[PDB]
Amino acid sequence: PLSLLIKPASSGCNLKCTYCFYHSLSVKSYGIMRDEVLESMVKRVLNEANGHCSFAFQGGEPTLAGLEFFEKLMELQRKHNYKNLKIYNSLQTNGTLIDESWAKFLSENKFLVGLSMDGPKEIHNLNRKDCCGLDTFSKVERAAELFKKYKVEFNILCVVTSNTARHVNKVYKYFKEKDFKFLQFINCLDPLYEEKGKYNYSLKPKDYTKFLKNLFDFWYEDFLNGNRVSIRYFDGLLETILLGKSSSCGMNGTCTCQFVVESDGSVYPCDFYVLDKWRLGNIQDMTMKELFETNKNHEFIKLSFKVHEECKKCKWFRLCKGGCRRCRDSKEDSALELNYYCQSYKEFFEYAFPRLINVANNIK
Numbered sequence: 001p002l003s004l005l006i007k008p009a010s011s012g013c014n015l016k017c018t019y020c021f022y023h024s025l026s027v028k029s030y031g032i033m034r035d036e037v038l039e040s041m042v043k044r045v046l047n048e049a050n051g052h053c054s055f056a057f058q059g060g061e062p063t064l065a066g067l068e069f070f071e072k073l074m075e076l077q078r079k080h081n082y083k084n085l086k087i088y089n090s091l092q093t094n095g096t097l098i099d100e101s102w103a104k105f106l107s108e109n110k111f112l113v114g115l116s117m118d119g120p121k122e123i124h125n126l127n128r129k130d131c132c133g134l135d136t137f138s139k140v141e142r143a144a145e146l147f148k149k150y151k152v153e154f155n156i157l158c159v160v161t162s163n164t165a166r167h168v169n170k171v172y173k174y175f176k177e178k179d180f181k182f183l184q185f186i187n188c189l190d191p192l193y194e195e196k197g198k199y200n201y202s203l204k205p206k207d208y209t210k211f212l213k214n215l216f217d218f219w220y221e222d223f224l225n226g227n228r229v230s231i232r233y234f235d236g237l238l239e240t241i242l243l244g245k246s247s248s249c250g251m252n253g254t255c256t257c258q259f260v261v262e263s264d265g266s267v268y269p270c271d272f273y274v275l276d277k278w279r280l281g282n283i284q285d286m287t288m289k290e291l292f293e294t295n296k297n298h299e300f301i302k303l304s305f306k307v308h309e310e311c312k313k314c315k316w317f318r319l320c321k322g323g324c325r326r327c328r329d330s331k332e333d334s335a336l337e338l339n340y341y342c343q344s345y346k347e348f349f350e351y352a353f354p355r356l357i358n359v360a361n362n363i364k
């Protein structure tokens with residue numbers, strides 16, 4: 001099967017989230033993806049894929065490409081899916097531009113949607129402000145309400161900053177109040193290769209430790225009271241515990257090629273690494289196999305197989321596996337270092353492992 005991460009509005013965005021290094025306003029934007037580039041990609045994937053394929057739309061804010069772009073996508077998928085493959089479409093959105101038309105489209109076409117929401121109003125608005133400085137929380141709530149009204153399948157993407165670590169109670173309680181049961185807490189990354197921990201929002205290892213421990217306590221109490229809440233990190237640990245492998249990139253110890261496609265058709269191995277040094281080629285000119293077998297992609301993946309010496313002697317290695325490579329990549333052109341959050345995982349596991357096992361045993 002083939003899975004692509006597409007940026008149909010490139011890095012363009014209507015917000016300027018304080019911690020965000022993905023958006024163009026003080027990052028290269030290639031503008032909105034042209035129809036001919038979109039068709040070239042869709043035709044290719046559906047010609048080359050076996051079994052099924054997946055198209056994920058991110059950025060940047062992908063809804064800036066407009067609804068017609070997405071209706072064209074669906075027409076092109078129908079046009080070119082001559083093998084009758086199952087297709088999985090998804091979208092990650094800031095939600096601010098979602099209206100009834102969008103919600104109907106997303107429901108009817110069975111998109112899985114990730115909606116970015118950092119917590120209740122003040123926690124969310126602290127960092128997630130629009131390009132004119134305005135608060136955005138009410139608009140994101142409006143999106144969630146529309147998704148609920150129109151039956152859109154969605155989950156929540158919450159960035160974990162230092163402020164999140166000081167207010168796990170408020171964040172957890174808010175999501176619980178809204179009955180959001182599918183949550184993904186994303187460690188806030190400082191910009192690649194910059195000195196770490198320098199911003200007011202920076203998630204330092206001690207902050208992450210505090211975050212993990214308290215989040216786990218809330219989640220486990222819910223588990224004990226028969227309230228199932230899905231948290232992606234914990235689900236991934238459970239997969240590793242029960243299956244020896246996780247469905248989430250960054251928890252299996254080595255990298256994968258994610259086939260990130262910019263709006264000009266240029267392809268990259270990972271959405272953290274949309275940079276000229278990791279440009280694989282252009283989806284209009286190269287087969288997916290070709291892109292995968294480029295020395296740049298081979299190098300990208302092979303770099304990730306190096307195991308730090310501490311991990312070799314770590315009692316948690318089989319559970320942690322060294323974490324995501326992006327958290328090990330401290331300086332350009334340099335060998336990977338020990339995971340930035342190593343100490344956080346170690347103190348979290350001491351605190352939570354036995355209870356994790358209990359959960360693992362009760363879900364078979």
Ligand SMILES: C[S@@+](CC[C@H](N)C(=O)[O-])C[C@H]1O[C@@H](n2cnc3c(N)ncnc32)[C@H](O)[C@@H]1O
Nearest residue numbers: 019020022059060061092093094116157188189
């Ligand atoms: C880059 S956005 C693109 C899609 C859409 N604009 C949105 O905000 O959901 C995808 C996800 O990355 C998250 N993100 C942004 N900056 C981040 C950072 N520095 N570290 C970790 N995640 C970040 C966003 O909050 C969002 O959940």
Ligand code: SF4
Nearest residue numbers: 013015017020060094
């Ligand atoms: S809305 Fe998404 S892409 Fe835009 S600045 Fe915020 S996190 Fe970045």
Ligand code: SF4
Nearest residue numbers: 249250255270324326
């Ligand atoms: S850097 Fe992390 S998210 Fe990207 S491919 Fe490697 S493990 Fe996966």
Ligand code: SF4
Nearest residue numbers: 311314317320322342
């Ligand atoms: S906890 Fe630290 S030493 Fe142990 S495997 Fe994870 S990163 Fe390596």
Ligand SMILES: [Cl-]
Nearest residue numbers: 135136137138
């Ligand atoms: Cl608001």
Ligand SMILES: [Cl-]
Nearest residue numbers: 184185232233
């Ligand atoms: Cl998570």
